[PDB]
Design a protein around this ligand. Structure first.
Ligand SMILES: Cc1cc2nc3c(=O)[nH]c(=O)nc-3n(C[C@H](O)[C@H](O)[C@H](O)COP(=O)(O)O)c2cc1C
Ligand SMILES: Cc1cc2nc3c(=O)[nH]c(=O)nc-3n(C[C@H](O)[C@H](O)[C@H](O)COP(=O)(O)O)c2cc1C
Ligand SMILES: Cc1cc2nc3c(=O)[nH]c(=O)nc-3n(C[C@H](O)[C@H](O)[C@H](O)COP(=O)(O)O)c2cc1C
Lengths: 264, 264, 264
C-alpha cells in the first residue's frame, strides 16, 4: 500500500517487478511454515492484536464491579533492510537478464527463517507458542524405515482417537529423510510407502526442525494471522545504492494442538 | 446480542424493558464521562485491543531481521451482577407502576462511577491514561468568581495558542460550583457569565473530580473506544431472584492533550 | 503549486493532509492580523511588487524629457524550515491518532508571529508601515472600565467625524483585557457593554500588541496583499527526517489611516 514508499525510490517499474519476482520466488520456495498452516487474510497495516476471546479478571472478590482486561495476541512487525547497487539495476534497464540481487536473496532467506522460527519454535516476548512447544503431543520413533512407518500409523490412530480426520502430512528434516532413504536399499519407494501409510498424504522436507512432525491439513487448526503480508518497500538512497526493506506484520496461533503429533 | 443470555431469564418482555428503561435513565443521567468525550462506535463483543499505531522494537542492533511488537490498548471488560426479586417483577406484571429496582439502581451507579473513574483518573493495569493525569496542562485558579472567569479566559488563550478551536465546556465539581455561586451575591448570573466567557460554551457539574477542568468539544480529541456498550444480561436464578449483570467492554484514549486544561 | 516540491517528499497523501490540517488549525487560530484586515487575493508565486500608484521624479527641472520611477511595495517572501521525524509519520500510517508534530507547531507559531509583527509593527527594510506606526491616530485611556467605554465612544465619535461608518472592533491585549475584567466585579458583562458601545461590534483579544486598538470592518481600508498564501513544501530529507518549509509571499498596506484609532 502507500506506506511502502515504493514510488519514491529511484527504480523503474521493471526494476521493482524484477525485485518482486525474485523475492516472491525465494519466499515461495523457502516458506516451509506456510505449506501446512492456515493463513488468515491480511487485516491491513493497522492491525495490532488478534483477539484470544478471553478475559483476565484483575478485580478483587469483594468488589461490586468486577472487571478484567481482554486477552489478545500482539502482532510481530519485522523490517529487514538491504541495499541494492543502483548501477546493477540500471544495467537491468540496459537489457541484462542476470542482475545481481545477492543481498535481496540473503535478506529474503533471513526473513523466511525468522518467520519459520516463529511458526515452529515460537516467541516468548510476543506470547506465541510454536509447533515444537507442544511436548504432550509427542511419540517416540526409530532410525529404521519400519519404525517411521509404524510411528506414522500410530500417529494416524492417535488422530482418529482425537477426532482429527483430514489429509495428513509428514514434516520431516531433510537430513533425517536422506538417512531414512539410505536404509531403504532397493526394496520400494520409501516416499510412496510413507504417503500410502499417511492415507494419501504428502511429505514436506524442511531444514527448520531436527526431528519429524505430523499435522493434518483439514484446516482451521493452525492459523497464521497476517496484518500485512510479506512486502518490499523503500527507505532511503545511500548515494550509490537504495536501502529497501522487507516488512511483515503477523502472529501465529495453534488453535487445536490435537492436530499435531511430534515424532522423536 | 445473543451472548447476553436474556432469553433464558424468567422475565417477560415488559419486565426486561422496564429494567432496561431504568438502567438507561440512570446511566444517561450519571455518565458524566460521555458528556464531552467522543464515543467510538461499538466494534462488537469480540473486540480485544485498540491499535495505538506504534511498534516496540525488541531486537538487537546487530540483528539482520529487526522486529518488534505492535502497541495496542487492551479493552477493559466489566461485569457487575445484581439480584432482582422475582416476586416484585411479577407484581410489575400485575400492574404495579413503582417496582422496586434498588439493587439495579445501585449497580448502575457503581458501573457509571467505575467508567468515570477510568475516564478521568485512568487505570494503570490496562495502560489507559485519564484526563486528570495530564499535569502539564494545568493552570492555577482562585476561590473568587473573578478568578474563575480569568482562569477561563486564560484557558481560552492557551487553546488559541495551541490551535484548538471549538466549543468549550467547563467540567467543574458540584460543591466547588455551589461555592462559586455563593460568592456571587446578586450581581449577575454566574453561569451566564461563565458561558459567555467560554465563547458560548456550557457548564458540566460533576461529582467525579475535585477541581475544575476545561475541554473542547470540536471532536476527535477524547476517544471512548467501545467494544460492547453498556448492556444487561442474565446469569442464573437464585430460587427467589434472578442474578442479572451489567457488562461493557471499553477503553479510553486521550489523543490530543492540547484539548485539555486543568484548573487548580 | 508545483514549485512546492511536495510530490518528491517521502510522505503519503494522508501524512501530507495531516500536516496541512495541523498547520491550518494553528494558523487559523493564531493569525490575529487576518481577523480584521482585508486580504487581497493571491496573485501567484511570481508576484514581486504591489503598485503604489505614485511616480518619484528623478529628473532635473531644466530637462526637456522629465521622467521618474514608479513607486511600488516589494513583497516579503519568508521561508521557515522544520524537520519532522519520518518514523512518527510512518506510525501515522500505522494508525496512530496523536502524531508528534511539535516542530511543525513551533514553526507555524513563529511564522504567524512574524506575519503579525509585519502587520502591526511593520518592516522598515520592505517599506511597509504597520498599524502601530500611526501615532497621529492615538487617544488616551485609563485602567478603569468606565475609561475604556468612554475611550470607545470617543473613538466612535472620531470615526463619525472622519466619515468612517462600519462595524467596529476592539483589538485589545489579552492581559489588559484580563485586568479590565478584574475591575468589573459583578456589575454586568464587560464584554457585552463594550460590544454595545461598539455599536454591535466584537472584541479581538491578541497577545500581539501592548495597548488597545480600534478599527472599522467596513472593508477596503487595511489590505494584506498576498502573492502566495501560507503554504507548506518539501526541501530535502536528512536521512532520518524530512526538512519541510512554510512559505508565504506578502506585503501590507494601510490605505486609510482614518479607519484606525490607537488607545493609550
Ligand atoms: C470480567 C468478568 C467476566 C466474566 N465472564 C463471565 C462469563 O463469560 N460467563 C459466566 O458465566 N460468568 C462470568 N463472570 C462471572 C463468574 O465467572 C460467574 O459467572 C458468576 O458470576 C460468579 O459466581 P460465584 O459467586 O459463584 O463465583 C465474569 C465475571 C467477571 C468479573
Ligand atoms: C520493527 C521496525 C519498524 C521500523 N519502522 C520504521 C518506520 O516506520 N519508518 C522508518 O523510517 N524506519 C523504520 N525502521 C527502521 C529505522 O527506524 C530507520 O528507518 C532506519 O532503517 C534505521 O537506520 P539507522 O541505521 O541510521 O538507524 C523500523 C525498524 C524496525 C526494526
Ligand atoms: C514623471 C512625471 C510625472 C508627471 N505626472 C503628472 C500628473 O500625473 N499630473 C499632472 O498634472 N502633471 C504631471 N507632471 C507634470 C507636472 O506635475 C505638472 O502637471 C506640470 O506639467 C508642471 O508645470 P510647472 O512647470 O508649472 O511645474 C508630471 C511630470 C513628470 C516629470
Amino acid at each position: 500500500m502507500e506506506f511502502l514508499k515504493r514510488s519514491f525510490a529511484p527504480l523503474t517499474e521493471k526494476q521493482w517487478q524484477e525485485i518482486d519476482n525474485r523475492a516472491r520466488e525465494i519466499f515461495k520456495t523457502q516458506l516451509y511454515g506456510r505449506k501446512f498452516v492456515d493463513v488468515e487474510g491480511p487485516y491491513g497495516w493497522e492491525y495490532a492484536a488478534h483477539p484470544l476471546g478471553e478475559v483476565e479478571v484483575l478485580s478483587d472478590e469483594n468488589e461490586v464491579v468486577k472487571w478484567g482486561l481482554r486477552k489478545s495476541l500482539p502482532l510481530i512487525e519485522l523490517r529487514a533492510t538491504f541495499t541494492l547497487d543502483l548501477w546493477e539495476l540500471d544495467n537491468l534497464e540496459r537489457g541484462k537478464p542476470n542482475v545481481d540481487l545477492s543481498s535481496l536473496e540473503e535478506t529474503v532467506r533471513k526473513v523466511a527463517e525468522f518467520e519459520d522460527e516463529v511458526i515452529f519454535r515460537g516467541c516468548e516476548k510476543s506470547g506465541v507458542k510454536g509447533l515444537l512447544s507442544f511436548e504432550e503431543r509427542k511419540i517416540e520413533c526409530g532410525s529404521t524405515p519400519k519404525d517411521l512407518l509404524e510411528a506414522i500409523v500410530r500417529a494416524l490412530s492417535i488422530f482418529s482417537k482425537d477426532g482429527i480426520e483430514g489429509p495428513y502430512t509428514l514434516v520431516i528434516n531433510t537430513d533425517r529423510w536422506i538417512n531414512f532413504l539410505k536404509e531403504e536399499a532397493g526394496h520400494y519407494p520409501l516416499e510412496k510407502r510413507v504417503e500410502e501409510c499417511l492415507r494419501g498424504g504428502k511429505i514436506i522436507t524442511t531444514p527448520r526442525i531436527e526431528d519429524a512432525l505430523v499435522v493434518s491439513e483439514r484446516g482451521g487448526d493452525f492459523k497464521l494471522i497476517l496484518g500485512q503480508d510479506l512486502s518490499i518497500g523503500y527507505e532511503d538512497r545511500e548515494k550509490d545504492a537504495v536501502r529497501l526493506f522487507i516488512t511483515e506484520t503477523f502472529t501465529f496461533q495453534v488453535v487445536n494442538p490435537e492436530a499435531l503429533i511430534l515424532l522423536k
